[PDB]
Structure formats: C-alpha cells, structure tokens
Amino acid sequence: TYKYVNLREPSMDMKSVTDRAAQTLLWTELIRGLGMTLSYLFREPATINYPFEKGPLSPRFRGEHALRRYPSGEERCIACKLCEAVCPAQAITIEAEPRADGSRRTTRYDIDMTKCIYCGFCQEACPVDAIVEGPNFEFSTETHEELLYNKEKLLNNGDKWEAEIAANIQADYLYR
Amino acid sequence: MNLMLALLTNFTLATLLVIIAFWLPQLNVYSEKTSPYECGFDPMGSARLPFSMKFFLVAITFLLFDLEIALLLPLPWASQTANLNTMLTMALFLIILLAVSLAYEWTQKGLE
C-alpha cells in the first residue's frame, strides 16, 4: 500500500500562528525534550560490575576447545579425519598413526587459535562426539608463539572443567 | 608596590615550568629519530596559505563595531551630571549610529 509522511500544510490563521510564534521566540519547544527527556536521570544505572559480577550466556555458547574422554579414559577422538575436512578456516591439523595395541589414535593435533573463525562446524561433524567448544573465555596471553595448540595442551584444557561441559550437552543434545 | 610582586611571581612559575617539562626529558638518552615522519596525517602539504576573503572581513567587520563601544563606555560615570537631557538625547545617538551601521552591511554578510 502506501503512507505519506511530511505532507502537511500550516493552518494559516491567527489562532495558530501565535502558537508558532510563541515557539520560535519563547523557546517553548526545545526545552520540551532536553529540558526534560534528558532528566530523567533518576533511573537506576545499568552496569554489570565486572571483575566480580558477570552476565548471561546460553548452553549453546562457543569458545575455548577441549577433548573429552569417556569414563576410564580413551581419548575419545578416533582420528577419522573429519573435523579437519569441514573446517572453513583450515585451522585443524591431524596426523594419525596406529597405536601399539592396534586401535588407532592421533599423534599431532593442532588447532590454531588465531585462524579458527568459531564456526560450530567442528562441534557438529564428529560422529564419535569428541571435540567440543568449551564455554570459557579464558584467553589472552602475551605471545603469539603461544596460541597455537598441541594435542597435550588441549586435553588438560578439556579436563580442567568437564563439570562445565558434561552438563551442557545434556541440556542441548535433545534439540539437534 | 606589591603589584609587580604579584605578576613576576606568576610568570616565574610558568616560565619555569616549561623547562622542567619541555626540556628535562628533551635531553634524555632515548632514540628520537630525525626521520621526516612528523607533521601528522597531512604528510607533505606544499602550498602558500591562499587568501580566503570571508575569513578576512570578520576581522575588519568587528574592529569598527569595537571602537565606539569604547566611546560608549563612559555612560555610568556620566549618569551623574547637571543638565541630563543632553545625555539621554545624545547617549541614544551613538547606539542608533551603531545599529544603523549594521542594517546597511546586513544586506551582505555572505557566509560569515
């Protein structure tokens, strides 16, 4: 359909034009709002007082990585070379080679933490359900020699909290 | 005799404080490369300052309205007199001689 805005005409009669000459010359407008709508300061401030208080999130949040393990640990990753092949940024790097018993596992697993674009494509391709984006924003170290991760940085970083992780998926896994 | 004691006191804190700020680290042993990298964010800028007029008149235009409000200044001493009509009849002339001098030029300010 339509509408027409800013289409109006002044009335042009001496009952009006005072009302527009009691405005220009006496400032009866322009004190209407910012004499007032500004104050209106008397509302409670809104601030999350940071070092202590913190704000909301959701169980589907994305962040620092992990590699779980079952009960008594198997290093849940089977090195099926997938979370590697859907990765848009191509951070992941994986090198398998048959472990002594003959069950296969990894050797090098490196997520670069600069390239990773935080998809949620590597949480959703792993069929054996290993690699999982953690919910902790612990980060920010002082040397780029660092953020590159090896395998045996990840596991700890994913065994430091599994009380966080193992209780999110069981909220979220019923939807997908 | 104590005014000049209250002036050269004031500058001498100020004319001191330049050196203890500007000069003191100015001889510090840091690098301070001579490279022509300075004069921020208009790197080179080779021109004369061109004449731009409506910059100029706002000088002149003031200077003349200025004078007579020195002439206008001794009203409040002159409000104490003998015959006062020669004041009100005369005092009110300067003003209207000021305000006229507006109305003419007011046809053209340009962009001021």
């Binding site: - | 209250a6 006191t9 004031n10 003191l24 300075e38 004069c39 409040p76 104490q80 009100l88």
Partner: protein, 318 residues
C-alpha cells in the same frame, strides 16, 4: 608576608583544576549509566596524582618543521593570563583592590586569544594552520556580545569596582531584573572558552584535534591545565556578578562557605551540558550571532539606560 598570601593562591587552585578532571567523568559517568574511575582510588580520588606523572615522564617531541622561538612564549602564557586574571577577585577580600578593575578582566579576557594565534601558527600546516585561524574568528565575535551585556548591568549598579557589586545585590539577587540578559551572559562564556555545544576550536568531530594536535605529553599538560583555568574562573565570576552572597563583617568565613556552594554548582553546568547537545557547523555558529544574539543586546542597552533616569533611580556612584 604578602608573598605568602600569593603563593597560597596559585598552589591551592592547581588542585581544583587537577581534580576537576576526575569529577569530569564521574558526573558525566552517571549520565551514561555507569561508574567513574574507580579501580585505582579506591574511590578514584587518587587518580589525578597518577595522571600528572605520566605526562612529564613521556617524551616531548618537537616537529622538525617548527619555529622553536614561538613554540614556547606561546604556552608560557596559557598559564599566565589564566593565573593573573584571578588576582582582583573578591572572596570577599580580593588580594588586590583595583579602582575600576571590572574593566581589567576584559583586558585579560581579550589578550588570551593572541596566545592561540601564536601556537597554531607557530607549528605547521593545515590541521593547526587554518585550523587555528578560524577559531580566532569566532573568539573575537563573541566579545561584542559580551562587553555590552556586561556594560548593561553596570548602569544598574553605579561603578566599575567589585566592592560595590556586593552592596547592590544585597537582598535582590541581581538575576531577577535583567533575567533576559543573564541568559546571554551564559551562552557567551560557554561559546567563548570553547566548550561543549559550540565546541569547534578543540577538535573532535569537525577535525582531528584542534590546536592541541602537536603538543606531546610535555607541554600539553599546560594547555589542558590552562583551558580549565579559564572555565572555573568566568564561572567563579558570574556568581559575583549575578548570584550574590551576603557579606558578613563578622564571620567572613561564612561568606566563602556559602559562596563555593554556589559557584561550584554553577560550574557543574558545562559538564551537565556536554552530555546533551551536538555541534553547530561553523557557518551557523557566527551566523547566529550578528543576526540573532546581537540586535537585542543593543536594544536592551537603550532600555537599562532609560530605566534609572525614568524612575529617579540613578545609582549612587561616580
């Protein structure tokens, strides 16, 4: 010990202009919904001792392209005519008694803008060159709005000195009778000293940073301490020229107590604005003075001239 009455003035004020910078962002903090510098204080009241010390450690570059002879005599001012102007200013007892001294402010109100034209020119090209030129141009056209509307009331009080101007405002807070003028006494000092709604001189929006751009931490404390030595003075003036207190030949002290609980409210006005209004686009900025502010200021002068004469009112002075 007259020399220890002076140095008791210059020093104890540099704390206000210091600790204004803190109440700058607390008051302007809660307009935004947040708290002000907090972590370092504990209350924050300890912030400005740490800030005064970061600059003068931090290296003071000069442009290779500058004329060093001007790059000193100019700031060696922005701290004089700011600290000299304070001299004859009754609270209640001024350090000097100047016979006609009210006029002496305009002498020192007029001679500061000739320290802007030096610095911005002293250095270099078009951000401080034509950028320090056209803040000259607005700073001198807001005097004619001034000296007149200062000269108006002085018909209504009799003389040029300040000891009379406490007597006449006795039981009449001189803001009733000329309240039309008083407004324009406010928008002036806010337009002249380069503060919020007409902000252009110091740049944020219209340019990068006006007139401050070159000075590194070394000299730039002075200006950033000079520009706030004008703002708390004109506003420590307005309230001797309008909202008067009641002298007390007995407890002088209760004069100043009730006096800083006014001038210190009043000031917290240039902060209570700056959160609020936008800028003028330099055309509209002067273009609104001649056309608009001025015609009245003349017209009222034709009025406060006659009102005494037409009531047998004429104030008791020479």
């Amino acid at each position: 010990m007259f020399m220890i009455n002076i140095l008791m003035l210059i020093i104890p004020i540099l704390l206000a202009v210091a600790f204004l910078t803190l109440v700058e962002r607390k008051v302007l903090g809660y307009m935004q919904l947040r708290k002000g510098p907090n972590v370092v204080g504990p209350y924050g009241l300890l912030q400005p001792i740490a800030d005064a010390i970061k600059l003068f450690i931090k290296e003071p570059l000069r442009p290779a392209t500058s004329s060093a002879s001007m790059f000193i005599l100019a700031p060696i001012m922005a701290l004089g005519l700011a600290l000299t102007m304070w001299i004859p200013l009754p609270m209640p007892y001024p350090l000097i008694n100047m016979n006609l001294g009210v006029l002496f402010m305009l002498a020192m109100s007029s001679l500061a803008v000739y320290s802007i034209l030096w610095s911005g020119w002293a250095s270099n090209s078009k951000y401080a060159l034509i950028g320090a030129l056209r803040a000259v141009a607005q700073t001198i056209s807001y005097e004619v709005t001034l000296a007149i509307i200062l000269l108006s009331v002085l018909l209504m009080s009799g003389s040029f000195t300040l000891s009379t101007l406490i007597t006449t405002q006795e039981q009449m807070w001189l803001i009733l009778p000329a309240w039309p003028l008083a407004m324009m006494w406010f928008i002036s000092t806010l337009a002249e000293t380069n503060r919020a709604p007409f902000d252009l001189t110091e740049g944020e929006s219209e340019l990068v940073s006006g007139f401050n751009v070159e000075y590194a931490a070394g000299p730039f404390a002075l200006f950033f301490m000079a520009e706030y030595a004008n703002i708390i003075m004109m506003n420590i003036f307005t309230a001797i020229l309008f909202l008067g207190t009641s002298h007390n030949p007995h407890m002088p002290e209760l004069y100043t107590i009730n006096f800083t609980i006014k001038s210190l409210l009043l000031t917290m006005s240039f902060l209570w604005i700056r959160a609020s209004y936008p800028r003028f686009r330099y055309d509209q900025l002067m273009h609104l003075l001649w056309k608009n502010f001025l015609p009245l200021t003349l017209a009222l002068c034709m009025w406060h001239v006659s009102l005494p004469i037409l009531t047998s009112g004429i104030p008791p002075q020479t």
